[PDB]
Amino acid sequence: LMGGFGLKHPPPQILIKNTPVPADPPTTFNQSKLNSFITQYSTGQVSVEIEWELQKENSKRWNPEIQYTSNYYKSTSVDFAVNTEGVYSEPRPIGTRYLTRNL
Amino acid sequence: LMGGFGLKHPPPQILIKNTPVPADPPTTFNQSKLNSFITQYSTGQVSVEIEWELQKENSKRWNPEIQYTSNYYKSTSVDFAVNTEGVYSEPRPIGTRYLTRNL
Questions:
Q1: Is some CB atom of chain A closer than 8 A to the CB atom of B68?
Q2: How far apart are the first and last CA of chain B?
Q3: How many helices (DSSP H) and strands (DSSP E) are in chain B?
């Protein structure tokens, strides 16, 4: 209902945590558990190869159907461009139902 | 200078004519030539297979470059459409230099 694809057996969920580094433990014994730790974190590179299938327009629509294109005029900040601050955004949302496929 | 392609050995020129059908010739001899004929013509189907080579955009232009598309609004007579009289025309001229190729 949020559009997209559904699967009876969808790609899994990836879960991670940082190894519990128990801080300095008491010299003498204690029955309780350890709460003290060392604030730490990590980084890394996320790789995700998504293969894709497609069906291209084979229609004989004689007239030039409509396409999607950035407006060909001159604007201050280019679309999907990075504002002079690196922070970039998206000018507008985009759909797929563009190619005029005969019903 | 009219844009396009030039060739030192371009596709030939095709020339045709109707067979000279000499009308009723004089019963007795005449030195001169024949001018009388029968007004006639012919028709047929023109076939022309043009094979083509192309180079597609492989650019990593992150932003959506510009494309050419019929204006997505509502007009009285669709572009390149046949007016209600079969006689159709072209709304506007079209060029190629559209894809933003890095210089």
A1: yes
A2: 22
A3: 0, 0
CB–CB of A90/A77 below 8 Å?
A: no
What span, in angstroms and rounded, lies between the C-alpha atoms of B59 and B66? 13
Contact B69 A64 (CB under 8 A): yes
Distance to chain B for A62, nearest Cα, Å: 8
The answer to whether A38 touches A52, Cβ cutoff 8 Å, is no
Q: Is the Cβ of B92 closer than 8 Å to some Cβ of chain A?
A: no
What residue type is assigned to position A81 of the chain? A
Give this entry's resolution in angstroms: 4.8
Q: Do A79 and B69 touch (CB under 8 A)?
A: no
Q: How far is CA B37 from CA A6, A52, B11, B79, B87, in A?
A: 78, 69, 34, 46, 36
Cα(B103)–Cα(B101) distance, integer angstroms: 6
DSSP state of B72: S
CA atoms within 13 A on the CB side of A55: 5
